[PDB]
Subunit: 660 residues, 3 copies
């Protein structure tokens, strides 16, 4: 029936933490501390006290033992390592650095207190999604504070699912940007709704799923857009019923950590959400905490920090006397999301004994997860060269000056609330690509086909699934659950090889088993050309402003520029790169031949001068093209024409040489 997971039960039965032995809290101490919470929930959550433990769909407990220990094949990683004799535990993706929300008292003073002395950082931080990821009812002006009304069209979803009303919700998680979710007053993750009644008075039935409000489904993927995609992808779901387990009762409210009417996780905020979308309460001790649980108002009134606040990155009380000590976040708590791939291990016998080298990112079904930018960057040249998040990003102003969409006429949507209203993100950067890649920027600056595209538009497609909307993941088509920006940069040019592949445990192309990034010959992640050129998304401002790129679904270009498969994209690339690489090689061979001749042939001074001059001008051209390294993809006309001139330089020198 109802119990903690195996992993947790095994650690509880034989704990090897350090709190008692060393006076220092470590991973296993966090697994054990969670037991009272689950015991309290099995006795006091309405699902047991009012609904008799009955649900439409099976309840499935998912505590820190599964999230912090088992996730990302941490047991396989552990067995593959020498650490603790191959007998230890590995927390691949979900863990905290400091005390959890089960420890009272804590030393948090709240971001407003940091802001008294650091008013400048408070301002830029406070207009970011870090600051408002956790909010209370009354803090949603972007839907005029109507959490139970349709956001967009009147037949699509509200933020809160039916039967969940604001007075039984501790908080929402998320934004209009991508998705929302909710926590009830007992700090249980909202993996359910209530049909035929309300949670608030124990009426109706608890139903699994239909729990996660999804912007793209609600706004952009109408039945007519779905039917357009279905012309290309004959399995694409159109009717609500074709979304199946991933769906629900109304377009816009999908099932997440649940399958609709079939199963639902039963999970406290402590097991998972506190890692990345946190809050902290001001209670003196845990009794005060347990007495306030189940009362949304009392919990809210005692909330001293919401979301990714100053102290979540910099430590409770920062550097203040009596505080816990200053930290400077490297972001890996919430943005790394390592996941071990036995396939990457098996496929490269050179990696033997180095299970770190077979790390991938957490996948949500067939797409790399949101909050995986760190595990993605780990296998890039950038990271090898010492670059980290803070190299490029401002850590405070992470959302930027984005705004609402005035053209949307929805039932509750209000476009005028700044970033709260926005469908996009524009993080403030310390470094642009053009700061370090000057030759690429130079070629790209010459007026041509993509000369208005940002560097990011080809190099950082929106490959990541935040929603685990597997009903719409058709990855070989570079769509359609595409809400976060890949941090990989390297573009592979190949007719067939894919960035994203199924694990060897997969038995159907759509089962979603053990999907992972593939690695190229340099041991790095890469972006395939279907993602780079032809991806489909509604999260990409650059793409929206460049005619939807080459997506058969969102491109506004003529239809002969709609790219349907990677081989077609590859052949377009080849049409540009092959003549460029031919002229390049011709020049290189010409330069070498002429330097050989100059070592033995004697020429009149004015002719010697000219021959040398042409060789060196040809060399300037080939050095520039070689350093650029795109073989015409950063600007074909400038590139081809410059090389043509250089071939002609070589031809002139050869005539002069032949003459003498």
């Amino acid at each position: 029936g109802m119990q903690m997971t195996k992993e947790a039960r095994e650690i509880i039965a034989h704990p090897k933490g350090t709190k008692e032995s060393r006076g220092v809290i470590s991973l296993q101490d966090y697994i054990v501390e969670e037991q009272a919470m689950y015991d309290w929930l099995f006795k006091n959550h309405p699902i047991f006290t009012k609904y008799g433990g009955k649900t439409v769909g099976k309840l499935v407990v998912k505590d820190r033992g599964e999230e912090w220990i088992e996730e990302g094949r941490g047991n396989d990683f552990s067995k593959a390592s020498k650490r603790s004799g191959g007998e230890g535990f590995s927390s691949m993706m979900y863990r905290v650095a400091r005390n959890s929300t089960l420890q009272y008292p804590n030393k948090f003073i709240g971001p407003e207190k940091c802001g008294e002395c650091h008013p400048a950082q408070y301002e830029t931080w406070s207009r970011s999604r870090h600051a408002t990821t956790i909010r209370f009812p009354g803090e949603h002006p972007e839907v005029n504070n109507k959490l139970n009304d349709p956001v967009f069209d009147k037949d699509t979803a509200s933020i809160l699912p039916q039967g969940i009303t604001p007075d039984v919700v501790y908080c929402t998680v998320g934004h209009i940007r991508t998705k929302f979710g909710f926590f009830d007053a007992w700090l249980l993750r909202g993996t359910y709704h209530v049909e035929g009644g309300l949670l608030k008075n124990g009426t109706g039935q608890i139903v699994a799923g239909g729990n996660q409000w999804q912007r793209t489904w609600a706004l952009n993927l109408s039945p007519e857009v779905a039917k357009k995609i279905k012309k290309w992808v004959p399995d694409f779901p159109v009717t609500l019923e074709e979304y199946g387990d991933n769906g629900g009762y109304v377009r816009g409210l999908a099932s997440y950590a649940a399958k609709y009417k079939k199963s639902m996780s039963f999970q406290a905020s402590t097991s998972y959400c506190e890692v990345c979308h946190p809050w902290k309460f001001d209670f003196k001790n845990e009794s005060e905490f347990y007495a306030a649980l189940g009362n949304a108002k009392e919990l809210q009134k005692h909330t001293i920090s919401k979301g990714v606040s100053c102290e979540e990155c910099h430590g409770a009380g920062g550097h203040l006397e009596g505080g816990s000590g200053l930290l400077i976040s490297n972001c890996e708590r919430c943005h790394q999301r390592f996941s071990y791939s036995p396939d990457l291990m098996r496929n490269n016998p050179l990696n033997a004994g180095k299970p770190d080298l077979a790390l991938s990112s957490k996948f949500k079904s067939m797409g790399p997860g949101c909050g995986s930018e760190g595990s993605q960057t780990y296998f890039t040249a950038h990271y090898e060269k010492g670059m980290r998040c803070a190299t490029c990003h401002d850590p405070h102003d992470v959302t930027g000056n984005v705004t609402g969409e005035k053209g949307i006429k929805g039932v509750s949507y209000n476009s005028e609330q700044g970033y709260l209203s926005s469908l996009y993100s524009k993080p403030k950067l310390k470094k642009e690509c053009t700061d370090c890649h000057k030759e690429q920027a130079y070629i790209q600056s010459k007026a041509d086909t993509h000369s208005k595209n940002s560097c990011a538009s080809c190099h950082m497609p929106f490959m990541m699934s935040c929603e685990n909307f597997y009903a719409i993941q058709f990855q070989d088509q570079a769509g359609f659950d595409t809400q976060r920006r890949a941090h990989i940069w390297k573009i592979d040019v190949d007719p067939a090889r894919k960035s994203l592949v199924a694990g060897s445990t997969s038995k159907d192309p759509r089962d979603g088993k053990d999907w992972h990034f593939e690695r190229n010959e340099e041991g790095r992640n890469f972006v395939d050309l279907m993602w780079a050129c032809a991806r489909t998304t509604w999260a990409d401002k650059d793409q929206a402003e460049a005619k939807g790129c080459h997506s058969p679904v969102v491109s506004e270009l003529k239809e002969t520029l709609h790219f349907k498969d990677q081989k077609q994209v590859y052949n377009e690339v080849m049409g540009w790169q092959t003549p460029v690489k031919d002229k390049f090689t011709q020049v290189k061979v010409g330069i070498q031949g002429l330097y050989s001749l100059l070592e033995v042939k004697k020429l009149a001074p004015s002719d010697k001068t000219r021959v040398y001059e042409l060789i060196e001008k040809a060399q300037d051209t080939v050095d520039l093209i070689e350093k650029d390294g795109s073989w015409g993809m950063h600007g074909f006309k400038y590139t081809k024409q410059r090389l043509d001139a250089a071939v002609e330089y070589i031809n002139e020198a050869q005539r002069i040489m032949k003459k003498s």
Copy 2:
């Protein structure tokens, strides 16, 4: 006699965090200061010996005004959503760790850090950070004569009349700019004693006459002042013309006081301990209060003076029993943010973003010393991730500067290294030329300003350390000019000014709400009068380059004495207009010729030759565009490159001309 209204309101309704959370925050510091002021009202000699009677009124200035109200913090607070607009904002003056009111502390002193880090002790100890706080007997640069004239026999001593070393806890400062003193009661020295000696309670307490100023004592003689008056007719020459700002002898001005009219009554705790600190070894507060009033006792129990290792790195650093290691970002002492209602109002894009209307603390009409951080905050360097530590060594902040052997003063001694110096030469990790290669390359060619440093134009000494408003005539780029601006961007305009009065100003001399202007990119900028024609005696580059174009200090011919910004602007236009005109024709030429290369009627070899010439010309355009000074970095070289490109374009046109 009472604490300020601001401090009293917080005392009446405190909302700090020391009791509620075990963590000391801003409001706790306001509250803790009460006992000190109660003690000073009963025990300070002004009251116990002079009966409360002063020539000039006493105006209490505690943390309530310094750490809360300054920089228009209450206006910033009301403009913020933080705490519903009802909070407090510490804009410029606050500490990060315990104040000097908490005993015991964990400070061990810099000599102990020095035992294991002898290398950093050596570089730090020969810096002004190390000696900004000194005790009588530590002033070899004036032969330890604190009561005799430093320079000429008719100019000031460091300590004003009535103030003797034995009633002084310390001096603050150096010969570099200015000195001040604290009395043995740790009250700031905003007064002197006429017809008597403080130590005897004889004579009368007189407001002002309290801050020794190097520039007034040494450089600004009535002869120099008369020379200035010739250009600037309201410039003061006689001592009485210096008015409230002055005093009874040249070289002792009034600061935090107006001569015979008003004087601040302020403990060290309210203000100075933020930036020119000290720490005592007392085991508790009773020992501290028992020593107060005894200079020798305080001195003996002083464990840290000035900006010592632990002031940046934390009491005890990383040592066991220490308070935890810090790495200073310098904003404690070098930021000095100040909110400008005008910057908010003037730019409706800034609405709801009061951080964007931040300026720097002004000392009347000039940006204050220690505002390098609030200046750099609104620069491209800062946007690109650059911070103090990007360019500066944090230890060797003074450099190898020395005294002036040519000065013959009553007490000045020129042989004490940096103590004797008029200048500063901070050690740098990065020079402008390390990152700005095109600019450095053009600037390296022998020409008019090729021997100037980059910093000589880009970083003028715009900042007032002394608040010597008697001599501030900002439209003329003088004359209270002691610290170096960290702005870099130079605006090229006939009239627009860096520094402007606030809209509360009713007279050009009243100095109300002065602030920096912002350009179209939202950045601070340096006007041409500052960049080219400023008058200062703190700038060694300017002293070694014939005084630049200051009508007051220039040793150049008189037509190179620039008297207003329009004149400077016309000189800049004499260079940039022909450059920009030629550049423009070359660029249009290149584009036109490139487009005409698709005309038949052109021999192939003519076609290639045309290309070869416009290609070379494009190199010139690219260098000039990148440089971006339009000849200000080296007119002769810029002209040599453009003359070449003019020939290339005329030769290509000559060849094109045959087609017709």
Copy 3:
């Protein structure tokens, strides 16, 4: 009477620490706290309890008083400083940042617990020599776990010297890479062996020295190689006896902190080793610690951190609740090793009052010591520009993918334990020379004599001594005790000036007194041509794959490329640089004159265009060669191809200007 050092006792008699006065432990507190340990050892170590205090060779106590205070002339530095009126102390090279191994309880949880949440960094750190510098018997698969049999040839050394058996060894220190040492079960540094019996039985005699297993002596420096070296360096030692006090009873076991049969340091791990090759125990208090001492098994059982583990760099407990506070190591605890040189101060009157500017590195006799990369880099352009270890190095994967020497057979050596078996190091870097030095890299990329060398091959010779094997230090010949890589970069071009020189106090070229680095006119350390080009070493994989470079000992090149002195190297450099500089000057002067002429001669527009084209293309060449700054040493053939073109350009423009 066995007692602590003069230096320790003087501080103990007049202590000026901060632990009692301020609640904060500082340097003098660490000196004071070492008393009980030495008193315990004088009473309880087998040297006294089983061998009656008798040893072949004099016992010389060396505690924190000498190591943490007197070393590197800290007393001279102190007297040259204004700090504490010239009357303070200065810890030049050996000191800790946080509690020593004398303080109990501590807050260490061990690297496996860090790695539970940081599995990635655990993996890379765990395959590095930081992780395994401290090991217990049982953990040496690279010798088939035979610490008492010969490693390599049957007539060379085992890791543990005779009389010393695994059961009375707490740990080894080191690797096959360079050398090993041991600590006995009482945590005394192994500066001795036992002849005629076993330490564990109290039989035999304690003999001084012959205590440090040395890879290069054991493997590479056979009597035939030594004879080859002797042909060039006549005083070079060939027979065991010619190694003298530095030597011992078997090739491969040298004397270190000891002179064979003559003297031996008596030193607890606390005095020196715990700075840089540390461990930590889990004991609740110092009683459990002392009760365990002398029992290797119980000490091992209670060892919670070994070697340079996560917490040694990051702090006990890291950032965890109840831990001691996160640190980010800047490496200077173990890799700096500053040493004050009164010669550098005296030779430069400008440095007066500034003793920091006369800092050098720890020397082990006549070679800069291992673990002095920091004091070296401190006087480099790179450091002046803000570069630190972490600019170039990954701090975790510091060993790299190096492997055993397959092809050598030895009685015990096992070549398939990966980095454990390896003779070399390949630290993972964040930045390569070529990332910042583009012009140099471009010229070096052109196929030519050295175009296949790494940048580091010439710029970072293996100048440093790990072993203090002074019997084989002949520094004017750039050999032969050469185990770690110099971090200096700047190459000086001179027929005679040397990087490494003897102090003023030296009275014999081989007495090894006060050796230091010389400083050039820019105030920096520099690499002389002998070290850069013709050095001899067995630690440099780049050199072994490039035919041994120009070493007369290891070079496989023709004998005319065996460089025997610096004057010869210099003459080879001048043969490249002189023609380059001559053409460069010709071009540069010609550009200048052409631009002047253009100001006052008139030409046909079409001629004028030509003169400009030729001058600008010559300028491009001048700017590249000048920025490169090697005057052909980065690629003579290409450098000459560019300058040959630019001489033509200028000649042709002068031709045109003549009419």
